[PDB]
Design a protein around this ligand. Structure first.
Ligand code: ZN
Ligand code: ZN
Ligand code: ZN
Length: 178
């Protein structure tokens, strides 16, 4: 197994996958690494199994149909993995914890949002459809773009949103378009 966490790229107290060489901090994995379970298979492995059980699940889908899906176990897992892919980027640090807003010439968002809030929301099964999860994720970056206006820091929102959107299209097998 790897000797650094797959998500944050640091060493520490690492839990190792039994079916692939990845390793994780306990609360870096999503869901948090399960207490017992020998063997244990990481989220990457669990997602690959879904694909292998239903190869047709990789055919192209329309975003509008994906968003309306109910959060059954497989869609719950897919959203957890998509959230984890965002945390994998080091620029996620900016969006993880609860923001505050005091900048001359800007007003804070009406509905603040952050990664750890989305994480808790998934853990507590608060989303009933994929749309709920995707809306909150996109809100994180939209709030940032609006608040930072012409400051070059707005680019961090564009960057992390791009990571989100690329991984959304991959994980949910969105139909490729020009
Ligand atoms: Zn970690
Ligand atoms: Zn694995
Ligand atoms: Zn099948």
């Amino acid at each position: 197994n790897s000797n650094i966490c797959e998500v944050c790229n640091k060493w520490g107290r690492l839990f190792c996958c039994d079916t692939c060489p990845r390793s994780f901090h306990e609360h870096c994995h999503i869901p948090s690494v399960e207490a017992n379970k020998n063997p244990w298979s990481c989220i990457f492995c669990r997602i690959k199994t879904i694909q292998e059980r239903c190869p047709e699940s990789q055919s192209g889908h329309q975003e509008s149909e994906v968003l309306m899906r109910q959060m059954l176990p497989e869609e719950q897992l897919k959203c957890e993995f998509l959230l984890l892919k965002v945390y994998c980027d080091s620029k996620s640090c900016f969006f993880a914890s609860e923001p505050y807003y005091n900048r001359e010439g800007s007003q804070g968002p009406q509905k603040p949002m952050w990664l750890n809030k989305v994480k808790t929301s998934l853990n507590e099964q608060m989303y009933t459809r994929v749309e709920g999860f995707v809306q909150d994720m996109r809100l994180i970056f939209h709030n940032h773009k609006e608040f930072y206006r012409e400051d070059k820091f707005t680019r961090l929102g564009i960057q992390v949103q791009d990571i989100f959107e690329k991984n959304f299209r991959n994980i949910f097998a969105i139909q490729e378009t020009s």
